[PDB]
Amino acid sequence: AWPKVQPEVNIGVVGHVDHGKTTLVQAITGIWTSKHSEELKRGMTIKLGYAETNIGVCESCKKPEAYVTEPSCKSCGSDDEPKFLRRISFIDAPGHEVLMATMLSGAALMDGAILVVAANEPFPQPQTREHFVALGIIGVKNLIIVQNKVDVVSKEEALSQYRQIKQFTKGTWAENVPITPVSALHKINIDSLIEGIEEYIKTPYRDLSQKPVMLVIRSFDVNKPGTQFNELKGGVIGGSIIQGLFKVDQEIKVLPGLRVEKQGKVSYEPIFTKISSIRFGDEEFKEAKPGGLVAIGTYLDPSLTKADNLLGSIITLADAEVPVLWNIRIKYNLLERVVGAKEMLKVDPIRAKETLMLSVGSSTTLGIVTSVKKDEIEVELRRPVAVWSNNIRTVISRQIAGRWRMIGWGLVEI
Ligand SMILES: Nc1nc2c(ncn2[C@@H]2O[C@H](COP(=O)(O)OP(=O)(O)CP(=O)(O)O)[C@@H](O)[C@H]2O)c(=O)[nH]1
Ligand SMILES: [Mg+2]
Ligand code: NA
Ligand code: NA
Ligand code: NA
Question: Which residues are involved in binding Mg(2+) 2 (predicted)?
């Protein structure tokens, strides 16, 4: 039998709207990531989606068909159990331009990524570009490019686009990134993609001695309506562990924490609590390591965690020393052009007093530029940000025609 373990690696799925990210994740895992009513209704990803699968290989069979996502080799005529390789999980990002920030949040949780490119749409589309560049900036460079929807175009058309993709990646960090043609919808050539995932998105080394840090993207509670009020389960906080590991009964804190109102004046106070449970998907564990999306059960009042209230927070051990900053200095670099815009547009230099959007970890925060230099800006934040390390990368966005567009990036200076 295959072991029941947590996913050991996170693979982002990104790309332009409707190019088939969620359907690809379904093709691989059997799971439709969209759980929210508005997502199902509007037919779009809004919040980050999530799905896990085991990966195995039938050692006596021919590749890529030998790769399986369930413990059976019957499809290659063997009654032998396939060799378990690892459990993996997917971070399914929204493609809509208006949701770029969400993609950015998800990118902080990715060990590698799949860029989905629709074979029946002109390449390169705005968010194909924006997601690609964002991946490059953030350092998610273990990339597979998937040409999806090949089922509706001839092989020749798909090859023409393939040539375009090679042209696009040439001279960039992605020059030798593999391109794999599939049909996510009708499940064609998925095995080649599994093989490619095993080859190009290896589980990274984890230094489990590092201080535990989790980036928070969800928060909620299991309590069904009409639940007896003093028998409510504690709040649950969901996210991904980016370093170290957490264990049941650990004393933890959520940073920056809780918004506090004092005569209409606002501060943030760390939220202290204790880990009552650890879960990945449908399985309970006693500890939680990088890879996968974890649900940390706590003793918190469910009202504190309701409706993703804590999105963008981080969680550390209670005694961790972590700067929570209302002002930050950023060593920055700007892109030459607003890659995510439909019509070509140059990036204007940063101006003092302008409002910028900053993506840091899973958080998204508006701030006012208080100082501009050639290599550095200083920003007064509308809300504080937890900065858990010295070389944290931030992505900078500017509001352009009412739309937040990525325009640069930088290092948060301590
Ligand atoms: N013909 C064909 N259609 C596909 C394929 N993959 C996805 N689609 C279709 O494209 C549409 C959008 O698919 P979906 O998987 O939701 O794309 P998405 O990129 O996650 C959309 P969003 O960016 O909002 O998250 C759906 O109608 C879906 O059935 C494919 O391989 N072939
Ligand atoms: Mg989707
Ligand atoms: Na990463
Ligand atoms: Na085809
Ligand atoms: Na190029």
Answer: 18, 43
Please tell me whether 150 is known to bind a ligand: yes
**In 3D, which of 85, 177, 167 has the Cα closest to residue 140?**
177
Neighbours of 202 (CB within 10 A): 13
- Beta-strand ranges (E) seen in 139-250 are 143-148, 179-181, 213-220, 236-243, 246-247
Q: Which CATH superfamily is domain 9-200 in?
A: P-loop containing nucleotide triphosphate hydrolases (3.40.50.300)
Neighbours of 352 (CB within 10 A): 11
Structure tokens at 388: 């858990």
Q: Considering only the top CATH level, what class is 213-317? A: mainly beta
Phi (first) and psi of residue 70, to 5 degrees: -160, 155
Helix (H, G, I), strand (E, B) or coil at 253: strand
d(CA 365, CA 330): 14
Resolved by: X-ray
Length of the chain: 414
- Residue 65 half-sphere exposure toward CB, CA atoms < 13 A: 9
274 to each of 114, 210, 249, 314, how far by Cα in Å? 35, 20, 6, 14
Distance 153 CA to ligand 4 centre (A): 5
Closest atom of ligand 1 relative to the 23 alpha carbon: 15
CA angle 15, 131, 325 (to 5 degrees): 135
Measured from CB, residues less than 6 Å from any atom of ligand 1 are: 17-23, 44-45, 94-96, 148-149, 151-152, 183-185
| CATH node for 324-413 | 2.40.30.10
- Which residue lies with its CA nearest to atom 28 of ligand 1? 20
Question: Which stretches of 107-178 are assigned E, i.e. beta strand?
Answer: 112-118, 143-148
Do the annotations mark residue 23 as ligand-binding? yes
Which atom, in ligand 1's list, is nearest to the CA of 184?
A: 31
Final resolution, Å: 2.1
Residue 401 has which token pair?
């025609």
CB proximity list for 382: less than 8 A, separation 6 or greater: 365, 366, 367, 368
Helix, strand, coil share of the chain (percent; to 5): 20, 40, 40
Structure tokens at 282: 């449908």
Ligand 1 atom 7: the closest Cα is on which residue? 20
Domain spans of the chain? 9-200, 213-317, 324-413
Sign of CA dihedral 22, 26, 28, 33: positive
Which of ligand 1's atoms lies nearest the C-alpha of 93? Answer: 25
Distance 68 CA to ligand 4 centre (A): 23
CA 104–ligand 2 middle distance (angstroms): 15
